[PDB]
Amino acid sequence: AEHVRAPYNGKIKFNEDLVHPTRTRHGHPAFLCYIDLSVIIESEDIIHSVTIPPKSFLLVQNDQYVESEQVIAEIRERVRKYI
Amino acid sequence: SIEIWYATSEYLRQEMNPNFRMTDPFNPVHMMSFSGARGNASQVHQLVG
Amino acid sequence: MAVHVPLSLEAQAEARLLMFSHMNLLSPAIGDPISVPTQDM
Amino acid sequence: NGFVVYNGFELDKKLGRPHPFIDPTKKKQIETTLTSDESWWNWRKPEKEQWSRWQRRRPDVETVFLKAMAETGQVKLYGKEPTLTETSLYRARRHLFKEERLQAERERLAKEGPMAFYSEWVKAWKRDTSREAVQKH
Amino acid sequence: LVTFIYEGLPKVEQVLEVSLNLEKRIKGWNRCIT
Amino acid sequence: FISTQGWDSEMVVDYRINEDEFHKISLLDCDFFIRKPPDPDNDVYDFREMYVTPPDTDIYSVPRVLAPMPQKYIRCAMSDYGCYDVTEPPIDAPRDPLYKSEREISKVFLTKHYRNRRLNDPEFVLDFEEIYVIDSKTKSITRARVLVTVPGGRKRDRKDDLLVIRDNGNSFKIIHVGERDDPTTVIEREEWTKTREDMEKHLRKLRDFSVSNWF
Amino acid sequence: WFPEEPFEAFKEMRERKVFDVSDMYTIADVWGWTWEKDFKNK
């Protein structure tokens, strides 16, 4: 797997109606992306775009504030557990 | 727990060489492994990552 | 550590002409050089 | 024909003089972001600050030298304390600033002469050490 | 309380001492080519 | 003989020219032919008839002309523009060379002699206002757009001016010979500009970049 | 992978020069044994 990280600080912008809600293997809510979604980060100087390829998890929300180098998306034996 | 820390460790190792190449090209630890004289990135990652 | 001294002239010829460290500069596996400088060199 | 023709910031940036990485005039806020009521649980800020063991900046040589150079005016920083970006940049160019300081000491020795210069390390010496005093003696 | 279920050198030795696709082709060729 | 002026920009011609009535100019991707009126110095060009060929071939076609061309004969000095391809070829045969050094010409400059004076004329100077550029990649010929910064205008001492060529043979500036840059300065300017951009790109992803200074 | 189908595998054997009809001969036909076809398949 490959992790997409934010190249700048700023505000995430995308249309949440273009993606499908899901629960990740870590128990978090997220979005499933089956298209070439365009995600915008508006930083302190300029506005920058990150292309989200299909079959990828979008871990952030629209209008969320992200920090640089923070994971924002993920491009994508039987064990017994005792509690 | 496993996946967040593995990804963090792997990201530190990936960023290790560009930090040396850009900010301390003649660092002694970098010169030993980067030139191929002795040591690899994994062993260096254990020291500084 | 083992040191062997060839006795016969046939054995001395083989040691000088086949086993010396300068006619064996290439490894037989892929043809790479054997004595590339390493470490402090 | 038509083939022969006869004839602050962004100047600091062109010359390499100290300047903000981002032009303050061409700098904008980041509007308003989710306020923990429009956010999922995993992206909400904790109500109380959490102890970390990484909550303090790591001390280093670069931070100390940059502050000392900021007080002599050799460089200018964005704020009172150097950032991690500024210490990284100092690490790359630190030999240039040291060479400037060494050159200034060479020029000062050539100006004052050996007596005035080296009297910094002879405390017991009380005679006037100026060039004119040396000549007069 | 609860039980969950969730998901080199020896390889060379195995090959040299003797693939599913190889075994089906040899069986297939054996029973038809004659 | 033939006026190719106003002809097709890439179509082949039916005949094979007599190559000794032409200047042959060899570039990386073409041979350029310009008619040569007879002259003892062999530096007079007749631009009314020009051809272009693939290298070492005798199949001629009219080149693309991107500027008005001189109508009468003019005397020009020729110089080539390009790079050295210094390689280390594989060593197959015994004593195969350790390196191969070849010159790759991408552009040719034809600089007019001022008032068409000869090289051995004691008043010889170059006329940097009239330069013609042959480009190997596009098989075309054009006139250079030259910017004059020397004070004096059209009537000036041409012995004092220096031509500076930059940007892959696309920018032409005439300066005074006293404003000449040291070769070290030229090289160091290019390195400073490149490393300054690369460093900022490296530092951009640090989250405190927006509140930090260059120094 | 050679094709699992037999006649396809025969074709691939000829294309990769593993085996061709020039290799199909017996002692009877290269030593001129014209009489042996009379003693077989009867």
Residue type, F139: K
Q: F140: which strand partners? A: F64, F135
Assigned token pair, F78: 């020729």
Distance from CA of A68 to the nearest CA of F (A): 5
- Which residues from D are below 8 Å from F149, CB to CB? 7
Comparing CB atoms, the residue among A78, A82, A83 nearest residue E7 is A78
CB–CB contact F198 B22 (8 Å): yes
User: Cα(F138)–Cα(F28) distance, rounded to whole angstroms?
Assistant: 11
Assigned token pair, F160: 């004092």
User: Cα(D51)–Cα(D53) distance, rounded to whole angstroms?
Assistant: 6
The answer for residues whose C-beta is within 8 angstroms of residue A53's C-beta and 6 or more apart is A33, A36, A75
Put simply, whether A64 touches D (Cβ < 8 Å) is yes
User: Cα(F61)–Cα(F14) distance, rounded to whole angstroms?
Assistant: 9
User: Cα(D112)–Cα(C13) distance, rounded to whole angstroms?
Assistant: 77
Asked if D touches A (at least 3 Cβ pairs < 8 angstroms), the answer reads: yes
- Which residues from B are below 8 Å from D89, CB to CB? 23
Query: Token match 């790759």: residue?
Result: F104
Residue type, F33: F
User: Cα(F46)–Cα(F69) distance, rounded to whole angstroms?
Assistant: 10
For this experimental structure, what is the resolution in angstroms?
2.5
User: Cα(A77)–Cα(F2) distance, rounded to whole angstroms?
Assistant: 82
Assigned token pair, E6: 């969730």
CB atoms inside a 10 Å sphere around CB B13 = 15
Assigned token pair, B19: 């930090």
